Write a protein that binds this ligand. Structure first.
Ligand SMILES: *[C@H]1O[C@H](CO)[C@@H](O[C@H]2O[C@H](CO)[C@@H](O)[C@H](O)[C@H]2NC(C)=O)[C@H](O)[C@H]1NC(C)=O
Ligand SMILES: *[C@H]1O[C@H](CO)[C@@H](O[C@H]2O[C@H](CO)[C@@H](O)[C@H](O)[C@H]2NC(C)=O)[C@H](O)[C@H]1NC(C)=O
Ligand code: MG
Ligand code: MG
Lengths: 481, 481
């Protein structure tokens, strides 16, 4: 029987942040235990370094330009959304009779009467926030109890952040120091109800950690020894421990696949309240390894043996691997990932040879920015980003504008994961890798047509969720805490 | 009974190079296994980022300026050396009847008739090279068999690199692809002879890995997937596995303490043939965390439980911890380290609160460059270094000259291990940390007097070891391969 699947997706968490990936001061003991008894990926990626596009690619297994999830991210007034025609993972498992649930951040659009919310995209249950938790004013929110306010205020002129239950506003805004319990409790109930109906569950846990502003419940506040980013990562980690215990308590260890990853690199613009890309260069917002190479853990006792692969994998491969593993069939669409079960089960290698990376602002004349094949990565274009400012590497800053590279900047990621030493700027291994990387970009660029942008369809403030429909004056009247 | 102690010391190996410290492509499975069953330090340091000074501080537990081991490092023609009056670790254990042995790099001086070599400083046995393996021409040496030459040539106009056995030249130069077996074999014989005389051994294994030029025996050549730096680190790692097996085979697991660390940060000047400081800044040659924060593993089954401490420790603390653990008494000199056995055995905390860092070129008007207390590190002076050139961080380059900082640059290493965000440039926690850091530098600077420099005592080419004493023309006639 198809296994129970729990998929945890962190926010803005970098390759250097878990203790098991090197950080000297993070406290993440549950995730360190998953790694110890599971497969830890050294080379897993997402294809775009922002929340919306990355969340689209994970849920559909498709490159976000194919369905319009560019440029940038969706906002609360956004008209647009992940089109209802896309088939998400949830649709695929639900059809094979999984009881499917989602807690936490959606960021795939809201729309006219909530048309784009999770309940329309295959989730049976949903408790969470429809976009990112800083997309609403937070100067008066508490981030750390008893009364430590969130820092900097978040986005102004907006409705406060709403917690939803299917399409209804449960709270607005919610109490950040208690979000976690709400989500643990929703998770526990979905497990148990699934067990009791004799059915596999799919839990999609999109945490708010470790996105700005940082918050945690009172057990973690000031307990990690890495300040607010730490406390917030310790809570995420504790949360994981909790789901693992609940998996315990219902006798489901050997019957559940648990995967952890994160949507994109760290926001170093938040300085020491933001993540760490460890040795990789830059972060969120860029196509350097720091923004697109994420941590990734796969645990299934008695199916996946403890270890470390260096094989290539993407968040784009998760739909196809989970369909395979649950005996569900694939949507009838072009998919950009592959099944990795041979790699997970130890019977094979990853089928993936190449990875393609688009910028925050893609366009059809430039096409893909970077391509990785085997050990080699070519950058055809480079660009820094405000989400990665403040570090000492100047190629990460927003003042490093869009620069073309012809011939591309060429790195051997197995000896230079750091992306410091351009091999062109000329061996037969190299030149052969160069002609391949050039042919693969020209091939994808001639074959992908960009789906018309959802984000450019505009904003309308009337689309903001409001607790007290009709009230006045908007947006501040919208609120039922 | 005092335990058998094996102390492994790598060369130019950074905080980001072991697989267990985060590297995505290194292959170090034996050391990853030590960490898994031992205590892994996140915050262990050396006090000076070069080979000579660091090797002096480990062996005596004293700050290298106290006995003249500055500026820079010793060369083959050097007149000077670690003074014979210093009491090394080897002296301390030998006196309590350890059979003491050393394999690999000395770099503590040679001198007129080998007066400063290991056999005069407490080692019963010694097989190794009296300085660094690139300090002699290597354009004709093989680094990777069957016939891959060492890269770049090393130092010219010198006698070739000599392999010594006590004070005799065994080979000149030696066959780099076979150094490891020679050293494994010497280690095995010291174990066994110690077992058979009913006595504890002390093995001091100073590896040549991962110093330039890189080399390995034919089992590792081209096998790691990180190129020559990898192959060379895989061999070091395999070597460790071997000593662990020999510890197995003579029934000595529970009776031996094995420690691994490294003398100083990575030489990023060798680009992708050099190490990785992971998230820390810069490398070898500097007083940034990248040059002085090393990996460190302590393993003793049934004495030290598996885990991770964040407590402060230094290479300066090893003499005193090993004396304590062997019931030997301490030299009657000022020591700058502490016993850490409570921390190793789980009964206590590190006594160390503060760490002091000197530059490659110290001087008495400037005094210590940086000071760490608790979580805070102050830099009073900063300076880049040619050994750390070629990265994107400009503070590491040799073009970043000696700059004073008053008030000092102040970092909170628990949230900013990266040393990116200066907290001055002003909370009560901060200001209190600032007055302490200032008082501790002024205190050490008024109390340490610099021992007269050994390195300035000059060079004399007649002090170069020569296989064929008297031959002509020197240096090329010196050679018996
Ligand atoms: C809102 O919608 C879902 C789906 O109806 C609610 O669904 C569940 O509610 C009860 C148990 O949780 C039962 O009445 C229904 O069996 C159940 N439906 C399914 C398909 O499981 C759910 O409670 C709400 N979502 C959440 C948890 O917020
Ligand atoms: C050179 O010096 C040491 C010390 O004499 C040699 O010592 C050992 O040699 C034999 C066994 O290894 C025995 O003859 C002696 O017991 C022994 N001495 C001690 C104190 O162990 C040694 O072989 C040489 N050093 C090496 C290994 O190069
Ligand atoms: Mg994000
Ligand atoms: Mg060195």
């Amino acid at each position: 029987r198809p296994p129970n699947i729990v998929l945890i997706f962190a926010d803005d968490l970098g390759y250097g942040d878990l203790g098991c990936y090197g950080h000297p001061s993070s406290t993440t003991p549950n995730l360190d235990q998953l790694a110890a008894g599971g497969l830890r990926f050294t080379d897993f990626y997402v294809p775009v370094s922002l929340s919306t596009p990355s969340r689209a690619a994970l849920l559909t297994g498709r490159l976000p330009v194919r369905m319009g999830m560019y440029p940038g991210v969706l906002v609360p007034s956004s008209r647009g959304g992940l089109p209802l025609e896309e088939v998400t993972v949830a649709e695929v498992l639900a059809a094979r009779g999984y009881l499917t649930g989602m807690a936490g951040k959606w960021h795939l659009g809201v729309g006219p009467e909530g048309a784009f919310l999770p309940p329309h995209q295959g989730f049976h249950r949903f408790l969470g926030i429809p976009y990112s938790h800083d997309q609403g004013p937070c100067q008066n929110l508490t981030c750390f109890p008893p009364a430590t306010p969130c820092d900097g205020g978040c986005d102004q002129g907006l409705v406060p952040i709403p917690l939803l239950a299917n399409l209804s506003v449960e709270a607005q805004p919610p109490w950040l120091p208690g979000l976690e319990a709400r989500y643990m409790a929703f998770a526990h109930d979905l497990m148990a109800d699934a067990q009791r109906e004799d059915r596999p569950f799919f839990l999609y846990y999109a945490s708010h950690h470790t996105h700005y502003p940082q918050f945690s419940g009172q057990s973690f506040a000031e307990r990690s020894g890495r300040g607010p980013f730490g406390d917030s990562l310790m809570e995420l980690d504790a949360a994981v421990g909790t789901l693992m215990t609940a998996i315990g308590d219902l006798g489901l260890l050997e019957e559940t696949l648990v995967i952890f990853t994160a949507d994109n690199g760290p926001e170093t613009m938040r300085m020491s309240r933001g993540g760490c890309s460890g040795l990789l260069r830059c972060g969120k917002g860029t196509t350097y390894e720091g923004g697109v190479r994420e941590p990734a853990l796969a645990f299934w006792p008695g199916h996946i043996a403890p270890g470390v692969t260096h094989e290539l994998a993407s968040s784009l491969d998760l739909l196809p691997t989970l369909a395979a593993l649950a005996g569900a069939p694939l949507p009838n669409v072009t998919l950009d990932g592959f099944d990795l079960s041979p790699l997970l089960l130890g019977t094979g290698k990853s089928p993936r040879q190449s990875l393609f990376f688009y910028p925050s602002y893609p366009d059809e004349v430039r096409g893909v920015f970077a391509v990785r094949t085997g050990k080699y990565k070519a950058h055809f274009f480079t660009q820094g980003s405000a989400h990665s400012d403040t570090t000492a590497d100047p190629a990460c800053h927003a003042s490093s504008s869009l620069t073309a590279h012809e011939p591309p900047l060429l790195y051997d990621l197995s000896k230079d994961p750091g992306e410091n030493y351009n091999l062109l700027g000329a061996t037969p291994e190299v030149l052969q890798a160069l002609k391949q990387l050039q042919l693969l970009k020209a091939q994808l660029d001639a074959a992908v047509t960009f789906g018309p942008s959802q984000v450019a369809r505009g904003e309308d403030p009337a689309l903001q969720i409001c607790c007290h429909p009709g009230c006045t004056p908007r947006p501040a009247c919208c609120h039922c805490p």
